Amino acid sequence: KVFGRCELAAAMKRHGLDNYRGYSLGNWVCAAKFESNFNTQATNRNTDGSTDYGILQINSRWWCNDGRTPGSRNLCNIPCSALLSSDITASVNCAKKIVSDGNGMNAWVAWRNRCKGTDVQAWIRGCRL
Ligand SMILES: [Cl-]
Ligand SMILES: [Cl-]
Ligand code: NA
């Protein structure tokens, strides 16, 4: 599923990502924009052999099981395919664990490089929330 911008903002808010760990909703929408262009089916292979899955490009080295990432973990206790669903629940629940891991949203390199320190509220401007 390719979400609309305000559609995704609303779904993230309903799933409790608004201000989760202090990160306002626009931070999460911005991260999703640059990680996946709002496409739940996005996948990308990393140079280390792991793969990133879903709207927030959650990696299989630590967070989900894809059966093909040697020596990896599955700390969200989910198949990576669950992160590709039109229903964002699994991605949100795993993102909550990731963002609590110690480095906040810096876990998402693209958030650090493209969202952090910017006017992230623009990503939710105009949305009925
Ligand atoms: Cl915001
Ligand atoms: Cl933080
Ligand atoms: Na894994």
UniProtKB/Swiss-Prot annotation:
It is an enzyme of class 3 (hydrolase). This is Lysozyme C. The lineage of its organism: Eukaryota, Metazoa, Chordata, Craniata, Vertebrata. Gene3D superfamilies: 1.10.530.10. It comes from the Eukaryota. It catalyses: Hydrolysis of (1->4)-beta-linkages between N-acetylmuramic acid and N-acetyl-D-glucosamine residues in a peptidoglycan and between N-acetyl-D-glucosamine residues in chitodextrins. Monomer. In the egg white and polymorphonuclear leukocytes. GO terms for cellular component: cytoplasm; endoplasmic reticulum; extracellular space. InterPro entries: Glyco_hydro_22, Glyco_hydro_22_CS, Glyco_hydro_22_lys, Lysozyme-like_dom_sf. Its EC number is 3.2.1.17. It is found in: Secreted. The gene is LYZ. Keywords: Allergen, Antimicrobial, Bacteriolytic enzyme, Disulfide bond, Glycosidase, Hydrolase, Secreted, Signal. Disulfide bonds join 6-127, 30-115, 64-80, 76-94. Lysozyme C is capable of both hydrolysis and transglycosylation; it also shows a slight esterase activity. It acts rapidly on both peptide-substituted and unsubstituted peptidoglycan, and slowly on chitin oligosaccharides. GO terms for biological process: cell wall macromolecule catabolic process; defense response to bacterium; defense response to Gram-negative bacterium; defense response to Gram-positive bacterium; killing of cells of another organism. Substrate binds at residue 101. Belongs to the glycosyl hydrolase 22 family. PROSITE patterns: GLYCOSYL_HYDROL_F22_1, GLYCOSYL_HYDROL_F22_2.
